[PDB]
């Protein structure tokens, strides 16, 4: 009875079940029959917002001086940086890249 489907905060490789990595963490090495899934911190300016078996953390969005933009909220390992424009310019949508 190798399990068909695993548990909520765990994935399946081959015959065996493994914890996911936590938000703020990337997969390094899959779980063994002895040790559990080896994860790692995202570090300075990347983020990953989810229980994940991902090999790289995503890059904090670039909040771009020369498209009318600055850092609204600093990103962190769980979150992503959030972008908002400079003043008399209102943002062209929620996601906020263009500005008049």
């Amino acid at each position, epitope marked *: *009875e190798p399990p068909t489907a695993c548990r909520e905060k765990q994935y399946l490789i081959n015959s065996q079940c493994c*914890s996911l990595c936590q938000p703020g963490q990337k997969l390094v090495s899959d779980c063994t*029959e002895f*040790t*559990e899934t080896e994860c790692l911190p995202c570090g300075e300016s990347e983020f990953l917002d989810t229980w994940n078996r991902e090999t790289h953390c995503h890059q904090h969005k670039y909040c771009d001086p020369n498209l009318g933009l600055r850092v609204q909220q600093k990103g962190t390992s769980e979150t992503d940086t959030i972008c908002t424009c400079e003043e008399g310019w209102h943002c062209t949508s929620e996601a906020c890249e263009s500005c008049v």
Partner: antibody, heavy 122, light 108 residues
Framework: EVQLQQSGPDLVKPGASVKISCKTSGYTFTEYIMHWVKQSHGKSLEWIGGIIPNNGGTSYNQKFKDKATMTVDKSSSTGYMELRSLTSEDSAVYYC???????????????WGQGTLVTVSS | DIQMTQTTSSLSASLGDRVTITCSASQGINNYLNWYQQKPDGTVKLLIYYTSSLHSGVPSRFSGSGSGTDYSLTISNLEPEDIATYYCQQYSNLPYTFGGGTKLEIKR
């Protein structure tokens, strides 16, 4: 119920070997790793090692690489462990326990033996 | 080898108090930790696996917190039959290692 029935107590001389026996039931022998743990009188638990029934594959704490040998007999649904080259550092209780191998239980050692007291003496 | 320190060898508390038992690891273990309960007669039972999940029989009184390097077993409403030694074990890295033990007694 699930139960693990280790061998009764053994008195054995220095230099000798002894083999102790975990005998499982209420559960499928091959779906769980047999792990062995030591406890010297009034001390902590030490992990010796684990064995997987289908691979016959093994991990051994280095502290015990030259002491300990785990084996399995898939037919009687029974694990063995065999301590060799005995001295009195080895007089202790030895527990078996199990880890579900597919991962239903994470890395819970969930049901334990009652222990076998090895006493090592002239 | 990851050294697991249960910093309190023993402690006693009145029935119905909350007790917290502490386990720190020589380095981070990303929550990869179980808690065991050895009663005076030497029988060992699992209590809590993956930091905080109760095993089969265990009462609601029991609970595990922790993260990173520092973990806690917590028994709220202490009962006369909670007397045991509590042991934490890590599965982040081999060899699997255990805490020194924390023996819990009743004040009466």
């Amino acid at each position: 119920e699930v139960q693990l029935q280790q061998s009764g107590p053994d008195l054995v001389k220095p230099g000798a070997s002894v083999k102790i026996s975990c005998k499982t039931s209420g559960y499928t022998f091959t779906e769980y790793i047999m792990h062995w743990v030591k406890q010297s009188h009034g001390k902590s638990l030490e992990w010796i090692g684990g064995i997987i029934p289908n691979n016959g594959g093994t991990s051994y704490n280095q502290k015990f690489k030259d002491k300990a040998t785990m084996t399995v007999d898939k037919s009687s649904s029974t694990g063995y462990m065999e301590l060799r080259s005995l001295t009195s550092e080895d007089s202790a209780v030895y527990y078996c326990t199990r880890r579900e191998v597919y991962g239903r239980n994470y890395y819970a050692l969930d049901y334990w033996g009652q222990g076998t007291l090895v006493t090592v003496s002239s | 080898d990851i050294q697991m320190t249960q910093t309190t060898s023993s402690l006693s508390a009145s029935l119905g108090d909350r007790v917290t038992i502490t386990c720190s690891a020589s380095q981070g273990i990303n929550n990869y930790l179980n808690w065991y309960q050895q009663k005076p007669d030497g029988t060992v039972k699992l209590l809590i696996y993956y930091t905080s999940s109760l095993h089969s029989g265990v009462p609601s009184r029991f609970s595990g917190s922790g993260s990173g390097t520092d973990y806690s077993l917590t028994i709220s409403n202490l009962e006369p039959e909670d007397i045991a030694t509590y042991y934490c074990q890590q599965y982040s890295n081999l060899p699997y290692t255990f805490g020194g033990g924390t023996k819990l007694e009743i004040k009466r």
